[PDB]
Write a protein that binds this ligand. Sequence first.
Ligand SMILES: Nc1ncnc2c1ncn2[C@H]1C[C@H](O)[C@@H](COP(=O)(O)OP(=O)(O)OP(=O)(O)O)O1
Ligand SMILES: Nc1ncnc2c1ncn2[C@H]1C[C@H](O)[C@@H](COP(=O)(O)OP(=O)(O)OP(=O)(O)O)O1
Ligand SMILES: Nc1ncnc2c1ncn2[C@H]1C[C@H](O)[C@@H](COP(=O)(O)OP(=O)(O)OP(=O)(O)O)O1
Ligand SMILES: Nc1ncnc2c1ncn2[C@H]1C[C@H](O)[C@@H](COP(=O)(O)OP(=O)(O)OP(=O)(O)O)O1
Ligand SMILES: [Mg+2]
Ligand SMILES: [Mg+2]
Lengths: 647, 193, 106, 106
Amino acid sequence: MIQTVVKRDGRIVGFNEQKIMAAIRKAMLHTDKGEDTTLIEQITDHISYRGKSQMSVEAIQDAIEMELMKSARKDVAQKYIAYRNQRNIARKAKTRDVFMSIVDTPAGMMMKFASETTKPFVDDYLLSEDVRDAVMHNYIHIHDKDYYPTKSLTCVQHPLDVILNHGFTAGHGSSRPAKRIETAAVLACISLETCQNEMHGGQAIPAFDFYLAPYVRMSYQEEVKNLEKLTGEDLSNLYDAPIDDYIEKPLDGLQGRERLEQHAINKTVNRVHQAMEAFIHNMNTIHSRVFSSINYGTDTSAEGRCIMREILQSTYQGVGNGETAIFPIQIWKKKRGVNYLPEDRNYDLYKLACKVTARRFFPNFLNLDATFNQNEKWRADDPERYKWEIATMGCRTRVFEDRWGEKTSIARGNLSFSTINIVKLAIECMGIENEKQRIDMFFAKLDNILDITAKQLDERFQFQKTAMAKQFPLLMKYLWVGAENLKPEETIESVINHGTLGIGFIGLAECLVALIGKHHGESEKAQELGLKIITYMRDRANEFSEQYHHNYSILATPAEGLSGKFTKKDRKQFGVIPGVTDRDYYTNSNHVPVYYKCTALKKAQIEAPYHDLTRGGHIFYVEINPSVIESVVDMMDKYNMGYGSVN
Amino acid sequence: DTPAGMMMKFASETTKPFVDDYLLSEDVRDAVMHNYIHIHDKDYYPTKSLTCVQHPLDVILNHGFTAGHGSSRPAKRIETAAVLACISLETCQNEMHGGQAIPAFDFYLAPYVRMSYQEEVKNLEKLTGEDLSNLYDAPIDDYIEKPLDGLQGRERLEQHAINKTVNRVHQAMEAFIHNMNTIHSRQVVFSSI
Amino acid sequence: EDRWGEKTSIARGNLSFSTINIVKLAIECMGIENEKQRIDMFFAKLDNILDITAKQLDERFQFQKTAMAKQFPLLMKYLWVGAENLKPEETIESVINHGTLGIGFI
Amino acid sequence: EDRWGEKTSIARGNLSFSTINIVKLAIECMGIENEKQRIDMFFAKLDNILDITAKQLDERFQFQKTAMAKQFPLLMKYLWVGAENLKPEETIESVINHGTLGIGFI
Ligand SMILES: Nc1ncnc2c1ncn2[C@H]1C[C@H](O)[C@@H](COP(=O)(O)OP(=O)(O)OP(=O)(O)O)O1
Ligand SMILES: Nc1ncnc2c1ncn2[C@H]1C[C@H](O)[C@@H](COP(=O)(O)OP(=O)(O)OP(=O)(O)O)O1
Ligand SMILES: Nc1ncnc2c1ncn2[C@H]1C[C@H](O)[C@@H](COP(=O)(O)OP(=O)(O)OP(=O)(O)O)O1
Ligand SMILES: Nc1ncnc2c1ncn2[C@H]1C[C@H](O)[C@@H](COP(=O)(O)OP(=O)(O)OP(=O)(O)O)O1
Ligand SMILES: [Mg+2]
Ligand SMILES: [Mg+2]
């Protein structure tokens, strides 16, 4: 018969026939009709005989189920199997993640639960038939689909002046306008964190130096007032006294009323340094607990320069014990006539920026001299000229133009963006040996996929309106264009049509190899064909914008949540192809593949003429001494490069 | 109506049936269904979380903390200790499902009022060149602020430092309250002191 | 209080708690007409419900162990009682017992 | 070692210990012709004997507590770990779990 049973943990025990009987009985006492031991005895006798003298618990339960689903009582088997499976799932939850398979920080687990429970229901009940079929067959990717039922937007550029000047009331929390540098930075961090919860993208602050400039003078005035209180003097003429720069100088060797004109500047510099050092640590820890971007560089004043040189020296020492800071993402705004040439006003700040980018990976560089960035309403004497300087985010997104409004990049943002796979569009028509027919079929299918993605974006726009203003407290009261005439229970459809709808692509080297012998980085004809298809998409986007009364733009997708979710589903359907579906990850939107070795000059020369057709966003990533960064910035200046992120 | 609220509702509704059907016993489920017992925070059952903790602030103030990729040096004033306390209270809320409390607020924040008193004195020494080495550990009965209507020598150079220390602790005690109240927009963290 | 520690309210908290419905038991014990047998039946039901509640709390405690210290970064490195002698991959069994279990009523 | 205390060896000792006869279990498993079956039977009997021994040690532990500290003046006033916090009439339950239980073999 059977002598020994091995438990699950590993213990060895003697065979006990009164254990199978009591287990079958508890499955017979949960059905419509129970039974006495008439069949239990037969099952146990059959199991005990025909054994191996040593059996496991699972090896006995398998036999129990096999016997139960074989003798006239198939209703006890289906109660036995389900209970066994539930107990197995319960025991597998002590060291694994079974609950995610059925459908580490607790907040992350809850967010994953929400995303997984939301995605399929949106995929089924909200999308139309044609768009659903297009999405199913690995054609188009709808970014942040989990947040679809929450009629949410992507990002916005914060007009920090409103908050800093009038105060903000969000819920039961109200805050007055600031009066020094130790509160303006905190209020900026509060605004970023608050608006992050209301949108599924990043947060950016344009004109970082301009907004905080007025709060460097206030600290100086407070220090002067406190300095004249213990001496009984009268320093009323120093309040509006112009200052060349807030440079710290040693105090020894002076006396009188010119010695205390420097103590105030010294302590003002110290306070501004501490404030800018707290900003970085806060925006790093909050993310490590939020996509944050700050752009600055086009201010010429003693206060803006002080802020720009304190931030650029607190980002040099790093965080903690010298560690580099991942956030916030810092961007330098370079213009011809402000801080570029050696004789311009802020050349030393530019030199410091180039030095810091060689140790701490930041800042980036945004070129204001490009054709698509220049604005005609700019004059370097208006104190509010920052409204006409373009700003970008760390997520590679641009919103400058507008067909029914001003050409500004403040208080505007993205509404939605979707990505179109074109490598499959090339493999699906790789069979043809004649080039002309192959290209014609490629274009014919590209037209249809573009129409489908435009219809999907229009439908998502139609769903995103009908959202009450109260659902977004901070965004639709202080941080959007017309968000000052909207009642709490009023639809935002009267101001929603000021954002950007993005159409992106992933992979162009692969498409050309699946089309012609090589990619754009080796063959000129492939480069011409790629430029042609990009221009065709841009013209179709213009037609869509004219037809649907919206704004459409072409984007180079950042490839942060779509790096791999396009090539596995093509390997499983088309097989391994040399140089196309044999690398793991597709190459980026229009870059140069990381394996085709090139120099910076050739890469820049080939990749430059795409930025004029990628108005929705583009990057110039170069892998690698301040001289190297200076050369990179000069190379960007020589061409129409819009955004660069050399490290 | 806020997106975070909708996501949390989805997550809780997803979690509850799994807890009912896979993790509870048969006698517990019958009592739960027949309106006998109520299990608090059942939506957080799969996340093996705790409810409450009393924060020891001296550990994170004398030394620093390294959570994730961030780091922080030990506090050296009153305008950074009151911020590190907020950071700890907001960071530990996402790892539990209850409330956060700070015991002995006065004891924990006391050793930094004195450090604030020793920097204004240093600035005064740098301005009016003296030594002032005996003012550091002078036993102060109270940090009360009074007007400077008539003083001279080493008696108004010691009241001025007290005035500045009081003005710097007021602006941090109000910042603590404002920061803990404004977590509604950014459920608001349940905090006690 | 602590049966295996010191009377310290620092670095300690609650693990979980459940509440017990008392009024339903009293409504169930309402057809009795002796004023002395009714209270005895109420107590008999209350004892069983308390036993089930304690069993549920113990089972939740057993599940709450086997949790790695690395999914509670700040709590199990600085803020808990013995957190300092723990490693990221170790479970919190050795220090979890300083918390409390709660039985409620309404 | 200590699962609920520090890893010291001062003021700690042994509560009781019991020994298990292994040779008799092997003599009983001697008529089996197959070697692997013999070893499996030996382990099956050893597991049961270990369970009974642990039960006996736990029962003796339960009896050993509820002993007044007055019965061991010096030991429960100065020599034990948690002593000096105990009244003469208080039992030693709170400080008895720092000892060790012993299973032995020959
Ligand atoms: N001692 C045994 N002798 C024979 N078969 C056994 C024995 N123990 C378990 N089995 C087999 C046959 C039973 O139908 C089946 C159910 O096991 P069960 O008695 O619930 O044990 P278990 O390992 O789950 O223990 P527990 O639930 O008490 O921790 O396992
Ligand atoms: N309520 C029930 N309904 C149906 N079948 C049951 C029920 N209770 C027990 N059984 C059956 C299937 C089980 O595998 C067997 C023994 O029950 P049980 O000991 O609870 O299961 P188990 O061994 O899978 O659990 P565990 O892993 O928790 O020890 O009897
Ligand atoms: N808002 C904040 N969020 C997170 N960390 C912060 C914040 N503000 C300050 N910190 C950090 C910066 C330091 O690492 C630490 C202590 O600050 P602080 O007292 O200025 O120390 P320190 O030694 O760097 O000062 P200093 O060099 O200016 O004399 O707290
Ligand atoms: N961390 C914070 N979070 C939110 N609001 C804050 C925070 N810190 C300060 N505040 C609020 C408090 C005030 O309402 C507002 C401006 O503070 P502050 O610069 O001290 O000016 P004030 O109006 O209090 O001036 P004064 O104290 O001179 O009268 O910001
Ligand atoms: Mg510092
Ligand atoms: Mg104030």
